[PDB]
Design an enzyme around this catalytic site. Structure first.
Site, PDB file in Angstrom:
ATOM      1  N   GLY A  60       3.642   1.160  -8.295  1.00 13.53           N
ATOM      2  CA  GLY A  60       3.266   2.322  -9.409  1.00 13.53           C
ATOM      3  C   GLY A  60       4.294   2.987 -10.058  1.00 13.53           C
ATOM      4  O   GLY A  60       4.164   3.002 -11.469  1.00 13.53           O
ATOM      5  N   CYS A  61       5.537   3.158  -9.445  1.00 14.50           N
ATOM      6  CA  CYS A  61       6.641   3.878 -10.269  1.00 14.50           C
ATOM      7  C   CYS A  61       7.320   2.866 -11.242  1.00 14.50           C
ATOM      8  O   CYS A  61       7.711   3.486 -12.326  1.00 14.50           O
ATOM      9  CB  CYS A  61       7.614   4.209  -9.228  1.00 14.50           C
ATOM     10  N   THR A  62       7.403   1.724 -10.961  1.00 13.78           N
ATOM     11  CA  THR A  62       7.858   0.804 -11.996  1.00 13.78           C
ATOM     12  C   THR A  62       7.221   0.557 -12.979  1.00 13.78           C
ATOM     13  O   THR A  62       7.444   0.673 -14.146  1.00 13.78           O
ATOM     14  CB  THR A  62       8.195  -0.660 -11.149  1.00 13.78           C
ATOM     15  N   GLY A  97       7.326   3.618 -15.214  1.00 10.24           N
ATOM     16  CA  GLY A  97       8.728   3.625 -16.025  1.00 10.24           C
ATOM     17  C   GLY A  97       8.459   2.427 -16.967  1.00 10.24           C
ATOM     18  O   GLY A  97       9.149   2.904 -18.174  1.00 10.24           O
TER      19      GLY A  97
END
Ligand code: NA
Ligand code: NA
Ligand code: NA
Ligand code: NA
Ligand code: NA
Length: 157
Positions: free
Chosen positions: A45-47, A50
């Site tokens: 999710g964080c990738t 970003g």
């Protein structure tokens, strides 16, 4: 116009960045700032989040804005994440959760028979005068960067 009031000291906190430099929120006076908090470097999710912001950077540039991503991972972790993903904006290593606490993104859940704290995925839009004019809490990644850009365009005009 403010949806959140930050402690005055928040604006002078030294924020350690990917690449080995520091910034402060006061240093960003004069332009719009998107601050997005995410739980963990190099996770799906964080990738995705970003990379979505990275793909829209020229649109943020048009609108007079900078982006900062924030987690509590180390500077070295952030350097690895930025290099692998090609991010063209900085990541704040908020190792002591000072910035996270100021924005009230550390949330407590009753699970595992305990009280467990963690970063809640959240984004904020900071005006050129340092006012927090929009907040998104408990963010769903899909469509989020697009929605933040649209809101910025609405506020900046
Ligand atoms: Na530092
Ligand atoms: Na630091
Ligand atoms: Na976020
Ligand atoms: Na600003
Ligand atoms: Na909101």
């Amino acid at each position: 116009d403010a949806v959140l009031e930050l402690p005055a000291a928040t604006f002078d906190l030294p924020l350690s960045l990917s690449g080995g430099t520091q910034t402060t929120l006061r240093a960003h006076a004069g332009h719009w700032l998107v601050i997005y908090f995410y739980p963990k470097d190099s996770t799906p999710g964080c990738t995705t989040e970003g990379l979505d912001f990275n793909a829209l950077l020229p649109e943020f540039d048009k609108a007079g804005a900078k982006i900062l991503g924030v987690s509590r991972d180390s500077v070295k972790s952030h350097d690895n994440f930025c290099a692998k993903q090609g991010f063209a904006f900085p990541l704040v290593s908020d190792g002591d959760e000072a910035l996270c606490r100021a924005f009230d993104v550390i949330k407590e859940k009753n699970m595992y028979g305990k009280q467990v704290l963690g970063i809640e995925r959240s984004t904020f839009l900071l005006s050129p005068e340092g006012q927090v004019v929009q907040a998104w809490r408990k963010v769903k990644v899909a469509g989020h960067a697009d929605a933040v850009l649209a809101a910025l365009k609405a506020h900046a005009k």
